[PDB]
């Protein structure tokens, strides 16, 4: 809370960053992350105070010998409290008191219950016994039976009744405990009495014993009283059941709420448990009680499902099980449920009482044979009867979803959240400081951490050490507690104080000692390449290396080599040495589980050997010793593990004898994924001792000059074991005993023993490359790779070598033994000499990148540099469908691959609410937002198809077109008629239309793409059919004739704005079509966007067919045009522009045009009044750029950042106030022009039936075939009768004249744009085009994105950003080639207006929009790059210069002055090229949308790069450039960034607006927040 504490944290943060070397756990944060970090700092400091210093207080106190006794627990605790009621208040003290108090309450309750139980037992024995005239004996008890059994029953009934009434009591109470104890005593004594009556003469004495044996020793409780102590509220126990994982897909056992009922996901679960631990293991050891065995806590670690359940149910079946005392139980008990079902109870733990394996089973419902089967539904219903429906909960569920989100990764931890989720967790143990040694050291409350190069240990604290540690740490924490509240005034840590500096010097080492550092706790969603992991390695490189290791590990590709290796290797005697390794014994333990039936059969053999041991010991002559007359556990266990090892190395073919009968089972096991992974993870461990056993000397075959010739500088480690990462992984509780201990060697210890030696040259080299570091250059990999020719017994092919060597590198990364680099370096040093060897290059490439990394962030360039050289050697034999490809490195975290195995088989499902929508479409449309986006990003929708909804959010559904039949109603789909989307260009003469029956039978709905600046017009074509037109012009309803229904822009326009958005569709209802309009908007909702129904007006409105609609609109349009001319006259007067002579020129002649003389006065007036504000705002635009240039380059972001916000607010006022006016003036002018053209020349001049009568704004515009095709496949103009869909569905059977499979994609695109073929032929040719196109894009570009990065690098580039291969503007058609033409037009605005920061922001936007393809922003972006394919405003921003050879283009750039940009718009594709010259010299840029954007300092370098790229690798021929193969010719188009920036892309966004440093939800927020608010 205190500002002073916040300033202190900011001070040490900034200072600790400034002190950083490379490789540090601090890094610079976002100014939002800053706050999340500080929040977690404060929270975890409070956790320390309550949960470790408090327990230390409980040992500085209690040092004096109070009365202590294991029996007088209550009294011991009571006096420990009265010892300390005098102690001053302090959070560690308060937490200690409160813990001791709650334990006092529990022990008091238990002691009360046990007392009243015993008194009741004695009372009932007196009641059942004879009068004092006789001794208590079985005879008199038998004589009493007929009366006093009924008396016992009567009392039991009375007690049960009274207790059931008392269960209405709101909390545990003396009466409740009393009655419960009485009931248990009566029940148990009744049972024992009846057993005595049933006891035989031989049992009678034992049953009388069991009656006289009162549990008065109190050595264990009555079971039901233990359950009483487990009750969470009187009459209820908390049940829980623990998941393997949250089972969203059914892979795991689960128990979850579904429709208010609780539901077990599977028919029985081994993982139930009851109750909850009374205290943490820390307190458990502080009381020095027995801790609960770890087999309760070990088996799972993910969120847990729990509810309160009625104690009677628990005590009926499960008290038979739940006793902690060793009552005889087998593996199982089967319990008859009253419905005739079984419940099976399973001894899933042989020691712990309160965790249970449970199964319900019974006669299979509705079956021909009475087989009993398990029944999850029966268990669910029985629980729902016995459960409370209230206070079901899942423990930690939000914590999981806010830190892991899902089962995150197949590799080691990266931050403490992933550590704490991992299987190694048990409980968060903070360490604290023991500073009274000469230098500071780390201690637990129980012990100080002894550390050694080999070993880490604790010596338990003697009293003087506890007094030191407590008094010091408490003195520090008291200061911290003061600073949060009394501030600097209280704490006296004034800015000049030496005490302040000492204090900070202590806090910083506290925050390092515990990994509360930023790299420890932030765990972001998408990792900026700045961020660093818990060891200070670069975060993104670690994530990528983990995803690489996983992908290599999962492929089935290398297995024929590795298992050949294993089959040979197993014959060496040294392999036995592998088994006594400590780490191998982690995982062969899992093999004992996987092969359990065989392993059991083996052990049943092995236990025979004991009999031969004892026999041999007796056969020895006159044995003076039981020489081996013993069961040697270690002998059998060794022999068994050795057998399991051999059966894992050599295949199941090794099975022999009777076990061949089980061999089909073993074969089925070992080929599982879990089988293969274990079967090789034991192999690589087995490899090391064998390699060592040859002792062949080191002899690398490739020399390297930079790092010492002839040797390697292996290992390169400093041993500096981290104590926190050790103790926060499960050591044995022997550490917790308050006794000195040596900690286990878990596998992670290999991850935690080592730290880089900054003095060594190899470290200096690696720190120049800035690889991750883990344990240095792998001398192990040297020792292995030196002898491969002897392990395999012959030379490897470079293919076989690189296969083995990549699998080994994956094994090393997977187990956390080394980095990628730490292995591949020695591989490249050891790669065999040979015609295809590649290590020489790889070394030179490392050196080349070293001399860079000392200066620049390599951002993964190294990994691509390696994979470019390895992959074509690995994949050398394979088909393109079967090649291996690793995940691809990116600025965002590593994304999945796009080729080969990773895709092979590795649509949205839709929701049945479609039937509700069908049932009441009006109510549905009133209550849910129906969006249409997928009806925009599909072109060429059929005339007839299946329509379905998909749910996306709360009341939010999307339509999709689909091919699935409605006769699978599970498709959630119905017959409907679609209408294609028409384009946004106001020059369009050819609207989209389709014809549908009056009195339809075939289908009852019609859908269209989202309306944004267009009209839906319904007209009556004849007696029986409507023609429905989607026209892309505003106000189009005025232009057609015989209009019977229409929705124009004005009907859904937000008044006083350019903004509008609406879904429109048609429905056949009450025997007539109804035009249904659902007005929408985009709205901001917590740094995201969503659609919603518009709430400021009726979201739905409806027209039946009408006649007067034309007149009704026309009057409105005339008035509105007059009114907007008033608006513009006003504003122009406000800026002093002369309106004289501005009026409509009488339309005399000619086609539609912008800047036609008739409107020229209005257009000029707009253009000028716009200039009067555009020049004005530019003065702030420059200032804003100056600001962003200082924001990127300074520490104190939040100082100046708000100024950005205020300048934005200022500008957006001007936009909101005047852009709307100018836009509306343009629209009303284009509309009046088109109306004049109709009025003079008739509708046939203003609507055309098809586009084949080629004409436009000029007689030809020489648009590339690529562009004119993409336009022809992202808008519908003309109808699409079924023939086109039939051709598309049959396109592999159909044949087309003058086409063959070896035509280029270009020559097909051309012939398709000839339009001469039938619709069935055009459908087939379209399909053939898309198939050929993506086959070529795969073969030419995705498979070679690696080498281009390196060509641009060593041609000399000075900045680069790869762009996502994956971002597509349409899921259908040619995905590859359609995005190029809009993207270059956006990018050139970005670059001209914001330089390298613009390019960064835009590529970030593309990345997010490809990672989350269905988030609101990624939809809006896709819907806003479309509408740049043919927007005539973009043609206003163009000038098609001639063809040029590349050299001339370069010379032209050299000739340019000031910023200038050019597209190349090659015949089938569009690179971009251009220059900026403002400062930092002249930088020349090049951009290929299939690869990335690159920059250069000099035109010589630029041409040297661009030639290599376009001709050196022949891509100019794949892009179909003009003229000769050598010296290709390109068009070029001198884009005017002054005008291109301002083209409308719908929803009121200028392209600049999508092209900006903020997120779209920011800009839209600012608009709503300054327009509608204020």
Numbering used by the authors: 4 to 909, 924 to 1591
Paper text:
The bacterial Makes caterpillars floppy 1 (Mcf1) toxin promotes apoptosis in insects, leading to loss of body turgor and death.
To test the role of the C-terminal region of Mcf1 in the autoprocessing reaction, we purified a Mcf1 mutant devoid of 15 C-terminal amino acids (Δ15C) and incubated it with Arf3 in vitro. Therefore, we only concentrated on the heads for the following analysis. Nevertheless, we managed to determine a cryo-EM structure of the complete head of Mcf1C1397A Δ15C in absence of Arf3 at 3.5 Å resolution.
